[PDB]
Design an enzyme around this catalytic site. Structure first.
Site, PDB file in Angstrom:
ATOM      1  CG  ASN B 397      -1.914   1.150   1.215  1.00  0.00           C
ATOM      2  OD1 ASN B 397      -3.066   1.008   0.815  1.00  0.00           O
ATOM      3  ND2 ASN B 397      -1.463   2.306   1.700  1.00  0.00           N
ATOM      4  CD  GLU B 398      -1.648   5.506  -0.093  1.00  0.00           C
ATOM      5  OE1 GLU B 398      -2.650   5.927  -0.715  1.00  0.00           O
ATOM      6  OE2 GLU B 398      -1.303   5.999   1.004  1.00  0.00           O
ATOM      7  CG  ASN B 449      -5.602   4.040  -1.435  1.00  0.00           C
ATOM      8  OD1 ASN B 449      -6.525   3.238  -1.549  1.00  0.00           O
ATOM      9  ND2 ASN B 449      -4.568   3.836  -0.621  1.00  0.00           N
ATOM     10  CE1 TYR B 455      -6.029  11.865   1.743  1.00  0.00           C
ATOM     11  CE2 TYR B 455      -5.156  13.769   2.863  1.00  0.00           C
ATOM     12  CZ  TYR B 455      -5.673  12.503   2.897  1.00  0.00           C
ATOM     13  OH  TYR B 455      -5.845  11.893   4.109  1.00  0.00           O
ATOM     14  CD1 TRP B 535      -8.999   6.076   5.205  1.00  0.00           C
ATOM     15  CD2 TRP B 535      -9.003   3.875   4.822  1.00  0.00           C
ATOM     16  NE1 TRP B 535      -7.946   5.532   5.900  1.00  0.00           N
ATOM     17  CE2 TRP B 535      -7.930   4.180   5.686  1.00  0.00           C
ATOM     18  CE3 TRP B 535      -9.202   2.550   4.434  1.00  0.00           C
ATOM     19  CZ2 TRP B 535      -7.061   3.212   6.167  1.00  0.00           C
ATOM     20  CZ3 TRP B 535      -8.337   1.587   4.906  1.00  0.00           C
ATOM     21  CH2 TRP B 535      -7.274   1.923   5.767  1.00  0.00           C
ATOM     22  CE  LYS B 556      -8.879  10.705   5.567  1.00  0.00           C
ATOM     23  NZ  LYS B 556      -8.491  11.220   4.236  1.00  0.00           N
TER      24      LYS B 556
END
Ligand SMILES: [Cl-]
Ligand SMILES: [Cl-]
Ligand SMILES: [Cl-]
Ligand SMILES: [Cl-]
Ligand SMILES: [Cl-]
Ligand SMILES: [Cl-]
Lengths: 666, 672, 672
Positions: B397-398, B449, B455, B535, B556
């Site tokens: 993930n990321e 994502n 963002y 999320w 969130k």
């Protein structure tokens, strides 16, 4: 489907004996013409039926040649003969493959290792039906053992490891069931495996039970190395929750057991067998219980021959016979006096018939037939083992002196039957009416062939007979395993005693009717008779004798030997037994009346009938021996011609019957 | 029942660090008071939740002394830890029994051969949750690795011959499905046996499948000598005819698979596992197919901490999260970012949720974590192999620079998963929105994502994005692996733009709502999104940081960290997803109104509703972005109390939603 | 050949640590002079062999700068390093391409996407060979991990889609064989394919088997779109009818497999692999079987270092070592204690040598090596998967406390091997003589290192030992995995007891010979030693100790560390194992006679020979320990010189060996 099973009835030649004793002269006969023949075949289709005391009874050879390809390498090959009369020996390229005694049981042998693959191979069968004192039946009296290969032959190919095919020619699978009820039932499946190779082989045995419809009820799988040393026996047990009971004719429900031999994930062999879950019980003096419920035992009997075909039948003939047996409302058959076709037995499973199977230990003992009788009894049991229909095995029929020997023999047959399959009853049949005959009481059930009013005493004598039995032997399970009378359709008359001199060549249809009318009524009212079996469903051949003005014929049929015609008693029984609507006038075949003031009888199982003698309705009708039996006692006939018509109704529907009698002088 | 498995959670004492370097001072710390504690326990439950960037991370010791009877003579004894954050050492009377690194997987060590029987024995477990470059997750930035024996501990007693307790802490049986359809399924059961004796042993392995209702389906039996040399492996093979398939929430049918090892026709070991017969297939463009039928993938996510418990949860807790997920109408769950509880995965099998399970490789790569990353992957899979509910393994993930490395690593992971379980899909998740990032495409399914309007860019830019993606790469299996917005219940307003600074401390509930009301309606219309996971189902600790005016909190969630309050989105998805009647007025918590003429949103999955303002039906009701979405704008407010009652009847039942507002003068909380 | 595999050993510069700690000082060091150097290369060739307990273990950097033309665009490029001692990190233009731990396995990484085409690019490799508790071997006790890039490097060029070059650096194709006999054998080929681009790609994979002579004997071909999402696997299966079986030294027949990837009726990539169809099998107590026939297992070992060169060997050296192995009569090799060169493995496949490959998990456990141990075993297996000659994978060698840990490890390794290559055996090696040892029996075969008369007991004790194992544990597969005695040529004496003080600095060649003479006699008559392995075909460096009067040397070699002299025992084994004529007189290097009346020992593997003292035939020749062993006692020596001539003939050729001693007074070096 990994096992290969193919018909092998095609392309045989046949040479019948007798054969000369001089080798010079024998070799000539051998070198002569062979007749080309299809299986099933027999050499007595004509000479055992058309005349008496005059039929060939000795050896005959069958020959066939056949290409076997190279792709049979590492395979195992088998010949399976359904039936051959009476002794047989098979040679493959001259090499003896197997021999058998008994013209009524199957047999197999492995021929694989005697074939030359990629080549043509000669198969030969020596068949011989001369009676010998060491093989049953020992003579040809009650009936004749038609000679030859009178049931189909199969080629069976398998892998090196297989479900055995040479266990007395059985399927190699044995199913048993214990503690059976509405709620559960424990099934056991025992399988015999054989590894003809030289090293242990890793395999898997997977046994599945399917529902009639096709669902998997259960699976039992086992992995192991199959020894090359000896045949091995494996077991599977299943606990069946609320099984669909096989309930005779109403609900002949059949599960399907499939047994699979697997190697490396793949099926290399398999056998499938029927499973009719059910329990049978007999309580003496009370009756027969199927899964706990009292069950009607309306019995009939059937021989495996048709007029013209001898015993060389096809499936249509067995089916046709079972249809008749069903239609008349029979619930139980006694297939005397010998193992009969397996196809036939499987149909009884399917059809819902509860049935009795027998070995031909009949008429006379010689003192030399035991090992073969035991041997025939076992092939019967092992080959027929899985049929739910089967409830009893018949040990002997009408065998007497030497008593001490006959009783020893029967005892050991009973004993083998219980070693081989303790779950079924055994039974044995005597010709004498009295219980304590020196030869009785050696089986589960004592059976008696009684023919009151035909061989002995009078028709009505059956009643005092049976009543006296249960008075002295309340606990014995007894069956009336043969009764009836002859009926030559050409013979007609209304002058009848209560007996008939069976010596004089006149077998009037109407005396048969009279016998069953009265006799059925006694049987029905005497539950102590647990099962009765009329003799016989059809006329069959009896080559040893001529009686009742036609030769080589037993004419006690409810139907004629060619299957074409049903006698009066056919409709009597169907009238009393069947749920199907019968409306029937007696004596259509007695069409040239002898008297003026006659009796008219009519069978109806759908209400009080109306009869109209020549346009106009008679009356005075009253009941006969059973609520299905109607009689008009004093009918006055018109000269020249008369015309009888009958009419009842049920379910806003209307039933017809008309006959036509003739009268002028007396 | 031959195998004894009993809780080993009681009678431990704890002793947290840090510890002095000086032996003198360390010996003192060592000899001081130890805290008597209870498992599950963590030491970060408070300091990782109550305050940002300030929590203890390092060594801690657990100790317990246990009498083991002479009855264990000849027996095998194991410890099975379901989870320890983050690295573990276990000592038995001083002798090292085992090591483990990875605060998210189970581990087991045999210890019998070290006990003094008939005597008292000492177990010490050294736990350390300090981040280190060779173990994922390589930092505490995305969430924090709570230290401690925070999942339950088990004591397991066996016979000399057994099904292995010790194969990556897995159950020792492995169940497989090939060619699954209405009509049949091929089921394989792989079993591992260990003979700890010195001579072969006669045994029979019997494997059985039961129906959900307890009726035997099939057995496979095998007798052999179990070799004393190395663990062994045996296969059974069942062929199901017209299997009852496991169909998600409509029909979560579970067969029972039982493997008993036997000796002397006496059972000496068994292991029981679930079996859920099913086929998963994804077709790019079209969607997710369960046993051939299309199946909605309405996905949520779920971290494994509660406010105040940290990650030291009990089943009751796991169930309570599962109840909520079920009730929102979710059908798939992404359990980010790490292996989670087995009871949890297990209960999904039972409820019918289709779930995604993941390893904590995330945020950064250092280049020294490849062996650990692979090791956690393998354990996650072996321990989890049998859950019908799991459809995918998540690789990363990321994670970005160094690109070449991160790509190598994902490649080895994808591959490891195909080796260890080629029947399930693999996925990996990128934070950027473009397919051709140099680190994408190394797994079966590419997830992304996207927090449009939070963002990056406006709430509506999600549309153009998915439209371009689906055009340019019509063949990629692709999922929206995360989307949403923070929501600070204490923040409310109607002055919402289409973006929200995340650098200011104002995370208003109204803005999250607005995000979900809109983005759901785009997801719903593009099957090219094979699935979407929002999320998050719940706020969670993020001890690294303080955003939104609440320290160490990601907000969130549709429901609050303490599990006590559902936000409006909770009911937005519920209405959009569930088939239980829903009627819900939004903004119930924005009761202190700013503007006199405002909008009024109501949610209804059961027919257009009536809304009365102060006893007076409103009108203007018009369609939102989905058939469950109605707004009346513009309402004019009375002064003082205003009462919104919504009503709608369905089939002899009537439903009702009432909230209270208050207005007095014009305001604007956003201009702060 | 679509793929380009070229040599990449040229134009490298090197620069050993230790490196200054603060940046200014380090940056100076970096800007210092770099040694230009040829690969293969180690910086330990010197200090690991020339003296004991003083070598440099630490970091070193290699640097090579390289031009990559534009024609590489849209292509993919890879580096493949065959071996680096011991940890490596490679950067391309200062970006991390890959990372590896363990100095004996290849690693690989795609560097293409970091290259700057039509320019100069700079590759940098950090190598570090300092022992650590998380990387095996954890210390340098048994031998030293010569550091640096001590094996060739390869530059590889491919298209967008290929047979993956990056799966553990394996060939990317895996070849298994099942149900093997004269009659037939099923071989499955597995191939892993990678599509680097953004779109499905239309390809065809064509798998072929060719006879050793070149005849297409099986083809399997498939067409399909290659998904861009994640690396894909394809299986092929070939039913080989009446295959020519690889039968060891009798007939090492090898088909070859060719896997071609094709696009647009054209070939885009290719890998070709050997295929030695054979079945291996052990039966405890009986022996080793090869395609169903018992086969002699005459075993030796070999470390991968040469005097002067350390481990930076070229092919000639491998070849050289193999020939001496072939020549000595060997049928099986144990390549302890780590993965060895693929050229070496390949050549065994060719000479039909049957071999055992091993991971350097030895001497100690630390508790922190598990993940890396697993790691290395996986790469070893995947890398050497296809070699027909390997029959077993070795998991550990003499590792003890903490037992429980050491056993958990061995078990997990066994399992990894069973997972990854279920068709080969696994073994582990213990130094103790007893079977029921706490860390034993966790692998298919139990090997035990036994040095009777050297580390313990007398030389003759190997007799009672083996007799008790075979009696007490009839069912266990058991190999004697090391045994021997040091032999220092400088040392010579006939003053020999049954055991030897290994503790003082005298290692007389004579003692070595006496050992093997007796001990091979026992090995030959107990089939319960399925296989035996003498230590060692060659002397090798042991940089930590100074034993037997020479630094940093293990001297149980049959041959010497420089490959120049063959010790006595060499020929002892050539007689007992070889097909070739052998006549040989022992003690040709022990010329300074210690006794007047001494014994002459000769070896013939072709009849009773004749011995001549000075000129007169000797008498009394009696039989020794095996049929090739003949002994003369008690020959009297002349004064000054004597010379000895052995002679023997057959098939009408003459055989003749001559040596020269000399009595000159009663000596006794042993007491001196
Ligand atoms: Cl004659
Ligand atoms: Cl019963
Ligand atoms: Cl198997
Ligand atoms: Cl300090
Ligand atoms: Cl499937
Ligand atoms: Cl089926």
């Amino acid at each position: 489907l990994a096992r290969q099973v193919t018909a092998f009835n095609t392309g045989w030649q046949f040479k019948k004996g007798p054969f000369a004793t001089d080798p010079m002269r024998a070799a000539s006969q051998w070198d002569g013409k062979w007749e080309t023949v299809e299986i099933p075949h027999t050499w007595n289709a004509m000479d055992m039926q058309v005349q008496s005391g005059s039929f060939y009874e000795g050896a005959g050879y069958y020959r066939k040649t056949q290409f076997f390809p190279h792709d049979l390498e590492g395979k195992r090959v088998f010949l399976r003969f359904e039936g051959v009369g009476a002794c047989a020996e098979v040679y493959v390229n001259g090499k003896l493959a197997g021999t058998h005694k008994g013209g009524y049981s199957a047999f197999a042998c492995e021929i694989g290792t005697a074939l030359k693959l990629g080549a043509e191979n000669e198969i030969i069968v020596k068949a011989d039906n001369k009676a010998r004192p060491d093989v049953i039946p020992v003579n040809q009296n009650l009936f004749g053992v038609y000679g030859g290969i009178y049931r189909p032959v199969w080629l069976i190919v398998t892998e090196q490891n297989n479900i055995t095919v040479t266990d007395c020619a059985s399927p190699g699978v044995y199913i048993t069931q214990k503690d059976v009820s509405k709620k559960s039932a424990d099934i056991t499946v025992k399988v015999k495996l054989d590894n003809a190779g030289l090293q242990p082989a890793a395999v898997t045995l997977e046994n599945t039970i399917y529902t009639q419809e096709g669902q998997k009820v259960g699976t039992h799988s086992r992995s192991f190395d199959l020894s090359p040393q000896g045949t091995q026996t494996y077991l599977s047990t299943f606990k069946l929750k609320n099984p669909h009971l096989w309930q005779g004719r109403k609900d002949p429900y059949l599960y399907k057991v499939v047994c699979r031999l697997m190697a490396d994930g793949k099926v290399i062999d398999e056998v499938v067998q029927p499973l009719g879950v059910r329990k049978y019980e007999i309580v003496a003096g009370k009756g027969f219980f199927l899964n706990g419920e009292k069950y009607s035992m309306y019995g009939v009997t059937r021989h495996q021959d048709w007029w013209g075909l001898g015993s060389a039948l096809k499936n249509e003939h067995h089916d046709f016979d079972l249809a008749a047996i069903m239609d008349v409302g029979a619930t139980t058959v006694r297939f005397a006096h010998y193992q009969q076709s397996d196809y036939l037995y499987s149909r009884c499973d399917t059809l819902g018939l509860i049935i009795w199977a027998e070995i031909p230990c009949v008429n006379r003992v010689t003192g030399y037939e035991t090992e073969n009788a035991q041997s025939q009894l076992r092939e019967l049991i092992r080959q027929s083992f899985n049929h739910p229909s089967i409830y009893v095995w018949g040990l002997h029929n009408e065998v007497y002196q030497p008593h001490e020997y006959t009783a020893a023999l029967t005892r050991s047959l009973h004993d083998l039957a219980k070693t081989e399959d303790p779950d079924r009853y055994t039974v044995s049949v005597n010709g004498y009416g009295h219980m304590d005959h020196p030869v009785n009481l050696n089986a589960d059930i004592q059976g008696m062939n009684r023919y009151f009013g035909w061989y002995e005493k009078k028709i009505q004598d059956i009643k005092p007979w049976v009543e006296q039995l249960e008075k002295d032997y309340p606990y014995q399970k007894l069956m009336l395993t043969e009764y009836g009378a002859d009926a030559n359709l050409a013979h007609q008359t209304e002058y009848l005693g209560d007996a008939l001199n069976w010596g004089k060549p006149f077998y009037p249809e109407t005396f048969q009717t009279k016998t069953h009318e009265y006799q059925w009524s006694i049987i029905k009212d005497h539950p102590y008779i647990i099962a009765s079996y009329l003799w016989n469903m059809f006329d069959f051949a009896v080559p040893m004798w001529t009686r009742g003005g036609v030769p080589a014929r037993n004419m006690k049929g409810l139907i004629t030997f060619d299957r074409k015609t049903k006698k009066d008693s056919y409709f009597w029984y169907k009238a009393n037994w069947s749920e199907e609507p019968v409306l029937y006038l007696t004596q259509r075949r007695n069409a040239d009346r002898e008297k003026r003031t006659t009796a008219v009888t009519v069978y109806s199982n759908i209400g009080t009938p109306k009869v109209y003698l020549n346009g106009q309705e008679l009356s005075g009708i009253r009941n006969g021996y059973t609520d299905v039996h109607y009689v008009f006692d004093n009918v006055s006939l018109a000269d020249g011609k008369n015309i009888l018509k009958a009419v009842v109704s049920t379910k806003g529907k209307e039933y017809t019957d008309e006959i036509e009698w003739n009268y002028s002088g007396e």
